[PDB]
C-alpha cells in the first residue's frame, strides 16, 4: 500500500520523461457497476442470472453461444458503451496521457471505458475486441455493429442475426473463449516489447486482473527483467505469484483507491480533479 505507492511515485519522479504501459482487467470497472461476470446476482447481470448457463464462462464461450445465443444477447444489451461512467482509475489513464507518460494501455475489458475516459485510440489495445463491428463466427465476414445493436432493443430478443453468406451466427467482434485475438494485440505488444528492451526507465503497471486468461496473462512474464513491474490487485496473482522478481512492486488496493493515492503522491490532484469534473 503506502510504501509501494511511494516507490511508484519515486520511480516516476526520478524518471520524469519515462512512459508507462498499463495492463488492466475487469477489476478496474467493478466500481462502475460492472461485476466480474462469473458471479451473477443483483445488478448488471440480474436478467442473465435467471435463465442461467451450464458454466460461468458459458456467456463468453463460442461453443455455448452456438448452442444458445440468448444469454450473450441479454448480456450485451447491458454492456454497450454509454451505460456507464468511467471510474477514477480510468481517468487516471487520461491524466497520464495528458502528462505525456502513457505509452499504452492493454485492456482485457470490452466496456471501452478507457476510450470513454478520453484515452486516445492510438494508446489503447483492446485485446479482447469491442463492439466496434460484428463478424460471422463461421465466415469471419465483417458487418457493421448496427445489425446486432438493433436486435438488442427488441422485446423479446428473438431471431438472432445470421450471416448473409453462410448463415452462421453474427456477433460483436468481442473475443469469446475459443476465438482468436485481434492481430493488433500481438503486433503492438511485439513493438512495445522491443521498446521495453531499449537512462529514463519505463514502467509497467498491471491493475485489476486475475491473470487467469490467456494469452493476455502471458504479458507480465514477457516484461524484461530489467524493467520494473507493478501489480495493483486485491491478491498477488499470475507471474507475480509464481515467479516473483526482487524489484516487483505489489499494491494490494482497490483500483480507484490506488488512483487517488498515486495522484496525490505525484502532486497531480488539481489536474486530476479537473478531469474528474467533466
Amino acid at each position: 500500500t503506502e510504501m509501494s505507492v511511494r516507490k511508484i511515485a519515486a520511480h516516476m519522479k526520478s524518471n520524469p520523461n519515462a512512459k508507462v504501459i498499463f495492463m488492466v482487467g475487469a477489476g478496474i470497472s467493478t466500481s462502475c457497476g460492472i461485476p466480474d461476470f462469473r458471479s451473477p446476482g443483483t445488478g448488471l447481470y440480474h436478467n442473465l442470472a435467471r435463465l442461467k448457463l451450464p458454466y460461468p464462462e458459458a456467456v463468453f464461450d463460442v461453443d455455448f453461444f452456438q448452442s444458445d445465443p440468448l444469454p450473450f444477447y441479454t448480456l450485451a444489451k447491458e454492456l454497450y458503451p454509454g451505460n456507464f461512467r468511467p471510474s477514477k482509475f480510468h481517468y487516471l489513464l487520461k491524466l497520464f496521457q495528458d502528462k505525456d507518460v502513457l505509452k499504452r494501455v492493454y485492456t482485457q475489458n470490452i466496456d471501452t471505458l478507457e476510450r470513454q475516459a478520453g484515452v486516445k485510440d492510438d494508446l489503447i489495445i483492446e485485446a479482447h475486441g469491442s463492439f466496434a463491428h460484428c463478424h460471422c463466427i463461421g465466415c469471419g465476414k465483417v458487418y457493421p455493429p448496427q445489425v446486432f445493436k438493433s436486435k438488442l432493443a427488441e422485446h423479446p430478443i428473438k431471431d438472432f442475426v445470421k450471416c448473409d453468406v453462410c448463415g452462421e451466427l453474427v456477433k460483436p467482434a468481442i473475443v469469446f473463449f475459443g476465438e482468436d485475438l485481434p492481430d493488433s494485440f500481438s503486433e503492438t505488444w511485439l513493438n512495445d516489447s522491443e521498446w521495453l528492451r531499449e537512462p529514463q526507465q519505463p514502467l509497467v503497471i498491471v491493475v485489476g486482473t486475475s491473470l487467469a486468461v490467456y494469452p493476455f496473462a502471458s504479458l507480465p512474464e514477457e516484461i524484461p527483467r530489467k524493467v520494473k513491474r507493478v501489480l495493483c490487485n486485491l491478491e498477488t496473482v499470475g507471474d507475480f505469484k509464481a515467479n516473483k522478481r526482487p524489484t516487483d512492486l505489489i499494491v494490494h488496493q482497490y483500483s480507484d483507491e490506488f488512483a487517488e493515492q498515486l495522484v496525490e503522491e505525484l502532486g497531480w490532484q488539481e489536474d486530476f480533479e479537473k478531469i474528474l469534473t467533466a
Binding site: 479482447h128 485475438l181 490467456y214 494469452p215
Partner: peptide, 9 residues
C-alpha cells in the same frame, strides 16, 4: 496465432 482460453502453458 493466439487463441483465448483459461488454460495455457
Amino acid at each position: 496465432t493466439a487463441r483465448k482460453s483459461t488454460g495455457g502453458k
